Structures are given as structure tokens and as C-alpha cells.
């Protein structure tokens, strides 16, 4: 089946995905996913999750890769963000490498843990400074020359200079700085590898907030590392997103981001985009709804039908909104607290079909919209902060449609003012 970005994502047994700064590693024909559990709705440490898959897209819940320890730095009462796996062919080992941290950032540590199964569970080997400098979002990059080289990538000396540095040969240790790029101001990073050439995927520092990620080029990781430029629309924060891993596929890549919810860290959202790098320059494929072939490392971008809201049935005080941020230049704003907008003529085979909510939202917060199909009950669907009145993003929906012509009417029965609605899409 899909990858459709920002809707609730379930494991096999029907729950929740929880797998927040995702880390990827393949095995024979298996996928592992690596994450944070935050189905506590904290910042502070519950576990490393494991989930597995043939096929990136259907996840089953083993047993949890990394757990608490009282009295050590991976109690309940410290920070464990971003696990990186990676497989050391000389010891036959999994090493298991995050950010370790206390509640208020102050520690700044990196640790490691190690098993000899993929999910394990592992078995830490303690928290440090690597080369007795500051450690926050990091991700390890393993290199493809014969001794497989791997390195830390990593945000150091309070998240103003970025740093790549060489392990050892047993991953367990950070030897020696390779790369620095200072006042960067980068977090979140990842690395691919495209034609002998190294792609640094990363973003900026602003909190929980998204903000336009980057990448950047080198031939070696040495560096010198090319300007910054967009994988996405600036104004969009990356489709509002942040980095998590940068998964090979094929002669592309998969963008895997977090949409992060602060006020309810378990709800926090995956952010899948093919990452395409023909052209040269890595960028996201918008896709609402995408598939995926793993083993032929191809994606497939899934066609909808467009439905601008300016050409629905406006009802309440709804209007029309201009700004050269939407699709046909119009969007329906007013919507909610009286304003509705009908679409009508949803063609469909029946059954269910996702359906995208084009929208901006330049409130700092969130808004929603009710969402009625041929005058059933509504269901309410979250509008993320999208940047600015003139910038557009989506989230998907799940709708039943007849067989047939449908309306599907948004706004209705709500006292707050919905997003300004640019257009939705029918998959
Ligand atoms: C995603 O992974 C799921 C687990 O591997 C997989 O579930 C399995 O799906 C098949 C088909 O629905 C089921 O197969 C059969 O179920 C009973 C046996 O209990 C048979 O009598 C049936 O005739 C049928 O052959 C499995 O039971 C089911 N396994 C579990 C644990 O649920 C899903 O199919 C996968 N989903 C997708 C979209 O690929
Ligand atoms: C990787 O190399 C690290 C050295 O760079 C090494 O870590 C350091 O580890 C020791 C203990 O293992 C720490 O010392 C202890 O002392 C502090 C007070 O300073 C207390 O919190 C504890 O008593 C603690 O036991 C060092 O401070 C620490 N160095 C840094 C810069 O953080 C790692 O153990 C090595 N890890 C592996 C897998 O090789
Ligand atoms: C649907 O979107 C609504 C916004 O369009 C949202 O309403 C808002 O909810 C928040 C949090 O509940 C309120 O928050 C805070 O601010 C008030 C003062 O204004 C304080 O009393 C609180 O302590 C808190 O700090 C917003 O005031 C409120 N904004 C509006 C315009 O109504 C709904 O929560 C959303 N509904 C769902 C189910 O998510
Ligand atoms: O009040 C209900 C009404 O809200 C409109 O939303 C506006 C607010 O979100 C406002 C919050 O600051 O921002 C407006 O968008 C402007 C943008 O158009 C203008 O260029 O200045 C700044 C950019 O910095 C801001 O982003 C936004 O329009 C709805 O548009 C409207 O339908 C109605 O719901
Ligand atoms: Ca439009």
C-alpha cells in the first residue's frame, strides 16, 4: 500500500507508530525502523522502539531496541533522541548510536549501545562528549570504501558549529574531527551518497518549529561542503517537516521528516517524500500519497483529481481570498464560524479514498476544519501553522465516497475560523 505523509501511521497489530527521529538499517530482506517512543507525550526517555517490514510501508512491533535504567543517564529522567543503527561486519555487531541528554539540553552527550541481533534489545555502554565537545542532533553516515569507515555527524559547541567526525574501527568511539562548518547552525542531519559524491541533508535550530531544510555537497566528507540550498519551497518549512533520515533508494533517496507536535509529542507525524537527485540537486517530490518498490528502489507518485474551493458552493459569510501562494490564485477564506464551502461533482468509484486539504494557515498555531461528505456526520482534521497567509501545505483526509457524483462540504458547524481552503485533491 501508501505513504501518505501526516496522516496517523498504525503497526500491524492496529497501533500507533512509535518511531519519532527515525533510523533505518536493512538486513537480508528485512527493514527495521528504529525511533523514539513518545506515546507518553514527553520529551524525556520511555524507549528505542523497533519496528520491522519487507517492504518500508507495513511495520510490525518487536520488542523495544533500548529501555530505561534507573540511576544511569537512560533513566525515565533524561532526554534519548535519534537512534542511529549501523552493522559492524568485523565484530558481527549492531551499534546503536543517539543523542543523550538531560531534560534542559545542558548535557549534551552522545551514547552508544550495542547488540548482536538487529532489534536486540541493546546493551548500553554509557553516555560522553565526543573529543570532549558538545553533542545534540546527530546521525551516523557509514561510508562504502573496504574498511567501511563511519563517522558522526553532529551539532556541537551549543548547536552553533556542525561536526563531522571519524569512529573507530569498532564504532564505540568518536577518533578524530573531520569536517567542521561553523556557525552553521545545523541539526537533524543525514548523509546519502550519489555518484561518489556526498549529499549532507540538515536543518536549522529553531525549537520544535520547522524551518526550511538544506542540503549541501562535497567529495569528500572533509569537506569543502557546497552553499545550503533548498530540498523544498523556502516558504513551506520543508513542507513543514524536519529531518530525521535520508534513506537510500535506488539512484534517489527518501526523505523520512518528523512533523512535531509539541503540545502532544506521541501524535507527532511522519513526513515521507521520495528525494529525487536526478537533476543533479536533491528535492523533495511532493507527494500526498506515494508508493514505494524497496527492492528495485523505485517510487510511484499516486494521480488525483484537483478541486479548487473558489469553484464550490460558498454558503455563511464565507469569501473569496487572492494571494499568489494558492493553486488558481483564489482561495475560500472565512471558513467556519458561519463560513462553508460545498465542493461538489467528487467523482468517484466509491469506497475509500484519501483526499488532501491544500490550505494556508498564517496563524503561529493551529487551526481545523469539519469535513462533511453528502451531508454525513464531520469529522475534524487538523490545519497546522502553514507559514504565512500566502504559503499553502496539505494534510490528508480519509473519506467514504459513493459511487458516482459526491459533495463534500467544509466549514460547517464550527465556532473558530477554519484555515483559508486553496484547493483538495481526490486520490
Ligand atoms: C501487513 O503485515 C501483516 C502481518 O504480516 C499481514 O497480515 C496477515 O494478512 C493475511 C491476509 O489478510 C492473513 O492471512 C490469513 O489469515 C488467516 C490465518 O489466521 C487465514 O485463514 C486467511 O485465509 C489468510 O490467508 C494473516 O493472518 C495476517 N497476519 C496477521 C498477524 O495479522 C497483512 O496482510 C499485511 N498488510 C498489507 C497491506 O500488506
Ligand atoms: C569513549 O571515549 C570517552 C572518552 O572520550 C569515554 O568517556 C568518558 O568516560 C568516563 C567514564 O567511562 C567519564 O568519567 C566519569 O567521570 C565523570 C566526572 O567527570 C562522572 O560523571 C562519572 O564518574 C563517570 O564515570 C569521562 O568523563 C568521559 N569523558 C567525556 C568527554 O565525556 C567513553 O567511555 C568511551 N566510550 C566507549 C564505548 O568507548
Ligand atoms: C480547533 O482549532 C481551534 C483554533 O481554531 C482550537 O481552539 C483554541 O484551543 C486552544 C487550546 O485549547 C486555546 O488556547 C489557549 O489560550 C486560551 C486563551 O485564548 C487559554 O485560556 C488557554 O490556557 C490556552 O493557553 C485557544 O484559545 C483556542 N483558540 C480559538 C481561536 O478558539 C481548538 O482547540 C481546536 N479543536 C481541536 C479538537 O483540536
Ligand atoms: O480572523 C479570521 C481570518 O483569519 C485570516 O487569517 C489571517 C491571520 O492568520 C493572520 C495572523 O497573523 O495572518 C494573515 O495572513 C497574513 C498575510 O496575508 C499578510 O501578508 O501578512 C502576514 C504575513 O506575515 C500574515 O501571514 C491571515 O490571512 C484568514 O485568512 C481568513 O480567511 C479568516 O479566517
Ligand atoms: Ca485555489
Given at each position: 500500500?501508501?505513504?501518505?505523509?501526516?496522516a496517523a501511521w498504525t503497526d500491524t497489530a492496529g497501533n500507533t507508530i512509535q518511531a519519532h527521529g527515525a533510523g533505518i538499517?536493512?538486513?537480508?530482506?528485512?527493514?527495521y525502523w528504529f525511533g523514539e517512543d513518545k506515546s507518553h507525550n514527553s520529551a524525556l526517555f520511555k524507549a528505542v522502539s523497533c519496528y520491522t517490514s519487507?517492504?518500508?510501508?507495513?511495520w510490525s512491533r518487536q520488542n523495544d531496541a533500548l529501555s530505561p535504567?534507573?540511576?544511569?543517564?537512560?533513566?525515565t529522567?533524561?532526554v534519548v533522541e535519534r537512534p542511529?543503527?549501523?552493522?559492524?561486519?568485523?565484530?558481527?555487531?549492531?551499534?546503536?548510536?543517539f543523542?543523550?541528554?538531560?531534560?534542559?539540553?545542558?548535557?549534551?552527550?552522545?551514547?552508544?549501545?550495542?547488540?548482536?541481533?538487529?532489534c536486540?534489545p541493546?546493551?548500553?555502554?554509557?553516555?560522553?562528549?565526543?573529543?570532549?565537545?558538545?553533542?545534540?542532533?546527530?546521525?551516523?553516515?557509514?561510508?562504502?570504501?573496504?574498511?567501511?569507515?563511519?563517522?558522526?555527524?553532529?551539532?556541537?559547541?551549543?548547536?552553533?558549529?556542525?561536526?563531522?567526525?571519524?569512529?573507530?574501527?569498532?564504532?564505540?568511539?568518536?577518533?578524530?574531527?573531520?569536517?567542521?562548518?561553523?556557525?552553521?547552525?545545523?541539526?537533524?542531519?543525514?548523509?546519502?551518497?550519489?555518484?561518489?559524491?556526498?549529499?549532507?541533508?540538515?536543518?536549522?535550530?529553531?525549537?520544535?518549529?520547522?524551518?526550511?531544510?538544506?542540503?549541501?555537497?562535497?567529495?569528500?566528507?572533509?569537506?569543502?561542503?557546497?552553499?545550503?540550498?533548498?530540498?523544498?519551497?523556502?516558504?513551506?518549512?520543508?513542507?513543514?517537516?524536519?529531518?530525521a533520515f535520508?534513506?537510500?533508494?535506488?539512484?534517489?533517496?527518501?526523505?523520512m521528516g518528523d512533523r512535531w507536535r509539541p503540545?502532544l509529542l506521541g501524535s507527532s507525524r511522519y513526513i515521507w517524500?521520495?528525494?529525487?537527485?536526478?537533476?543533479?540537486?536533491?528535492?523533495?517530490?511532493?507527494?500526498?500519497?506515494?508508493?514505494?518498490?524497496?527492492?528495485?528502489?523505485?517510487?510511484?507518485?499516486?494521480?488525483?483529481?484537483?478541486?479548487?474551493?473558489?469553484?464550490?458552493?460558498?454558503?455563511?459569510?464565507?469569501?473569496?481570498?487572492?494571494?499568489?501562494?494558492?493553486?488558481?490564485?483564489?482561495?475560500?477564506?472565512?471558513?467556519?464560524?458561519?463560513?462553508?464551502?460545498?465542493?461538489?461533482?467528487?467523482?468517484?468509484?466509491?469506497?475509500?479514498?484519501?483526499?488532501?486539504?491544500?490550505?494556508?494557515?498564517?496563524?503561529?498555531?493551529?487551526?481545523?476544519?469539519?469535513?462533511?461528505?453528502?451531508?454525513?456526520?464531520?469529522?475534524?482534521?487538523?490545519?497546522?501553522?502553514?507559514?504565512?497567509?500566502?504559503?499553502?501545505?496539505?494534510?490528508?483526509?480519509?473519506?467514504?465516497?459513493?459511487?458516482?457524483?459526491?459533495?463534500?462540504?467544509?466549514?460547517?458547524?464550527?465556532?473558530?475560523?477554519?484555515?483559508?481552503?486553496?484547493?483538495?485533491?481526490?486520490?
Amino acid at each position: 500500500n501508501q505513504i501518505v505523509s501526516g496522516a496517523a501511521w498504525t503497526d500491524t497489530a492496529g497501533n500507533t507508530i512509535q518511531a519519532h527521529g527515525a533510523g533505518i538499517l536493512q538486513v537480508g530482506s528485512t527493514f527495521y525502523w528504529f525511533g523514539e517512543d513518545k506515546s507518553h507525550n514527553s520529551a524525556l526517555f520511555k524507549a528505542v522502539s523497533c519496528y520491522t517490514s519487507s517492504d518500508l510501508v507495513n511495520w510490525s512491533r518487536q520488542n523495544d531496541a533500548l529501555s530505561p535504567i534507573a540511576g544511569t543517564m537512560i533513566s525515565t529522567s533524561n532526554v534519548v533522541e535519534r537512534p542511529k543503527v549501523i552493522f559492524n561486519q568485523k565484530n558481527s555487531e549492531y551499534v546503536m548510536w543517539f543523542h543523550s541528554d538531560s531534560s534542559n539540553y545542558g548535557a549534551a552527550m552522545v551514547g552508544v549501545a550495542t547488540a548482536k541481533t538487529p532489534c536486540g534489545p541493546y546493551t548500553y555502554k554509557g553516555s560522553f562528549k565526543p573529543l570532549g565537545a558538545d553533542s545534540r542532533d546527530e546521525s551516523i553516515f557509514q561510508d562504502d570504501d573496504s574498511a567501511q569507515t563511519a563517522y558522526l555527524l553532529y551539532a556541537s559547541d551549543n548547536n552553533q558549529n556542525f561536526k563531522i567526525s571519524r569512529l573507530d574501527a569498532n564504532y564505540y568511539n568518536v577518533t578524530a574531527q573531520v569536517s567542521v562548518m561553523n556557525g552553521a547552525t545545523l541539526a537533524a542531519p543525514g548523509i546519502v551518497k550519489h555518484n561518489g559524491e556526498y549529499f549532507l541533508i540538515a536543518s536549522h535550530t529553531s525549537g520544535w518549529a520547522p524551518n526550511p531544510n538544506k542540503w549541501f555537497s562535497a567529495s569528500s566528507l572533509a569537506g569543502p561542503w557546497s552553499a545550503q540550498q533548498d530540498i523544498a519551497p523556502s516558504a513551506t518549512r520543508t513542507w513543514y517537516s524536519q529531518n530525521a533520515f535520508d534513506l537510500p533508494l535506488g539512484s534517489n533517496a527518501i526523505y523520512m521528516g518528523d512533523r512535531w507536535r509539541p503540545s502532544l509529542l506521541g501524535s507527532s507525524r511522519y513526513i515521507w517524500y521520495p528525494l529525487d537527485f536526478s537533476s543533479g540537486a536533491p528535492q523533495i517530490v511532493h507527494a500526498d500519497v506515494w508508493s514505494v518498490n524497496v527492492q528495485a528502489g523505485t517510487y510511484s507518485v499516486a494521480s488525483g483529481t484537483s478541486y479548487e474551493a473558489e469553484n464550490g458552493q460558498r454558503g455563511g459569510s464565507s469569501t473569496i481570498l487572492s494571494g499568489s501562494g494558492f493553486s488558481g490564485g483564489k482561495a475560500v477564506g472565512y471558513l467556519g464560524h458561519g463560513g462553508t464551502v460545498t465542493i461538489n461533482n467528487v467523482q468517484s468509484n466509491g469506497g475509500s479514498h484519501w483526499v488532501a486539504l491544500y490550505f494556508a494557515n498564517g496563524d503561529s498555531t493551529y487551526r481545523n476544519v469539519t469535513v462533511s461528505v453528502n451531508g454525513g456526520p464531520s469529522v475534524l482534521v487538523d490545519q497546522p501553522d502553514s507559514g504565512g497567509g500566502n504559503v499553502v501545505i496539505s494534510v490528508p483526509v480519509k473519506l467514504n465516497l459513493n459511487s458516482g457524483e459526491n459533495s463534500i462540504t467544509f466549514g460547517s458547524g464550527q465556532s473558530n475560523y477554519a484555515a483559508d481552503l486553496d484547493k483538495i485533491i481526490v486520490y
